[PDB]
């Protein structure tokens, strides 16, 4: 088949080791070869390839392209790709090149507007250009793809089983004034914390992640749901520590630690690993870890429960990584590993490879990042079969253990509380009065029915 002159149509230049390299040890997926690197021209060509569709390349490209190509430039490139000049045998060229390449362009626009609409929300002119382009597309073959794109565009500009019974302990429904770590039911604490943290996990989009934006000076602007999620986790860890060290009487503090291990147990049963690691981080903090007299009275079974949870974090999360691979939704993964891996993938690989003196976009690094964001999306799909309790949810949304203090002042206060309630040997252990009027016994972590 005979194409136009590269002079008139840039996407007609043949492949060479100066414009596209493939991965030479990866099995192709569905017969398609894996692109390693390429000029942006060649990456656009393969994004809209006439021989076949490549949905996985399209997904990866639209998720990661902003590091090497701006949105206005990508729009100009796929418009240029769509406008194919002709070089009889035109019937062949029209049938096997122009028409399938144009369908690919429309498919790329459709996926762009459907799954990456934030580009258009942040650049109205980009949306103006896209609507203009779609309006110029006049053909019988493209009519219903054009119409479907318009439908999407206009839209964007705007359980099977029943859940278990909610559990109650000392605090009664509607009595928020008494809600607290020991007065709410530990099962229900774990459940409502899992609902909050699952919503927090599900709201994080790839746009807050690619480009390692959450680590840069504009993170509050580009990664607000991610940051809200992390700050919830930090808050719960600090509330756990605070509840422990501000309970100065030893017996009561043992009750507090034991109730926190019970919440961890239910976190494990729910596959809320963010919750598990909130507890584990609390137990590993300087103020709590040193409380030898408290852990001494923790029953051995709960020691083993905590021990299993803590061991998930050992050896760079080896057991956590296996456990998560083996479980099925719904769950709430710990996000920190994703963030470290995206950051080090982006920082530890070159933006560009060089071949015969020519610069090529390093695409396989982007593919690796898009694998990580895809793993995250896969756990965002399934929700929990659990009922919200608005008042418990509200109580945990508004936990503010730090109050008005700065981080250092507050963690120094926790550490000094720890030293007061259990002084360094050889200072004798003092006694402290009880602070709780109600019974400390736990209802346990098995439902009432």
């Amino acid at each position: 088949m005979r194409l136009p002159s590269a002079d008139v149509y840039r996407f007609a230049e043949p492949d060479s080791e100066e414009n596209i390299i493939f991965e030479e040890n990866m099995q192709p997926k569905a017969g398609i070869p894996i692109i390693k690197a390429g000029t942006v021209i060649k990456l656009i060509e393969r994004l809209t390839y006439h021989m076949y569709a490549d949905p996985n390349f399209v997904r990866t490209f639209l998720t990661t392209y902003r590091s090497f190509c701006k949105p206005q430039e990508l729009l100009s490139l796929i418009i240029e790709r769509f406008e194919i000049p002709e070089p009889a045998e035109l019937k062949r060229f029209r049938k096997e090149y122009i028409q399938p390449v144009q369908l690919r362009v429309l498919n790329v626009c459709r996926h762009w507007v459907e799954h990456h609409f934030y580009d258009f929300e942040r650049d109205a002119y980009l949306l103006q250009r896209m609507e203009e382009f779609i309006g110029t597309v006049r053909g019988k073959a493209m009519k219903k793809w054009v119409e479907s794109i318009t439908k999407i565009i206009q839209r964007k500009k705007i359980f099977q089983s029943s859940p278990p019974t909610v559990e109650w302990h000392i605090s009664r429904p509607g009595h928020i004034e008494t809600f607290d770590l020991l007065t709410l039911h530990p099962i229900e604490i774990a459940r409502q914390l899992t609902l909050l943290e699952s919503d927090l996990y599900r709201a994080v989009q790839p746009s807050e992640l690619v480009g390692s934006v959450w680590t840069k000076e504009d993170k509050e602007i580009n990664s607000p749901n991610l940051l809200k999620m992390i700050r919830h986790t930090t808050n719960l860890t600090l509330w756990f520590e605070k509840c422990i060290v501000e309970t100065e009487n030893l017996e009561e503090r043992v009750a507090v630690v034991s109730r926190i291990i019970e919440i961890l147990q239910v976190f494990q049963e729910l596959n809320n690993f963010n919750g598990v690691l909130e507890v584990v981080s609390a137990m590993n903090s300087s103020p709590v870890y040193r409380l030898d007299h408290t852990f001494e009275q923790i029953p051995s079974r709960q020691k083993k429960i905590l021990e299993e949870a803590h061991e998930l974090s050992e050896d760079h999360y080896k057991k956590y990584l296996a456990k998560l691979r083996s479980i099925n939704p719904p769950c709430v993964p710990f996000f920190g590993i994703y963030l470290t891996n995206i950051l080090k993938t982006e920082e530890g690989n070159p933006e560009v490879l060089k071949r015969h003196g020519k610069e090529l976009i390093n695409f396989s690094k982007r593919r690796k990042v898009a694998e990580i964001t895809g793993e995250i999306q896969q756990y965002q799909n399934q929700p929990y079969c659990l009922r919200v309790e608005s008042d418990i949810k509200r109580f945990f949304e508004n936990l503010n253990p730090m109050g008005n203090s700065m981080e250092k002042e507050f963690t120094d206060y926790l550490f000094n509380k720890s030293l007061e309630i259990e002084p360094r040997n050889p200072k004798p252990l003092p006694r402290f009065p009880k602070k709780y009027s109600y019974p400390l016994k736990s209802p346990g972590v098995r439902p009432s029915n």
Binding site: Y289, R290, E296, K303
Partner: peptide, 7 residues
């Protein structure tokens, strides 16, 4: 030995 929660 080890962690305050090691049996």
């Amino acid at each position: 030995x080890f962690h305050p929660w090691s049996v």
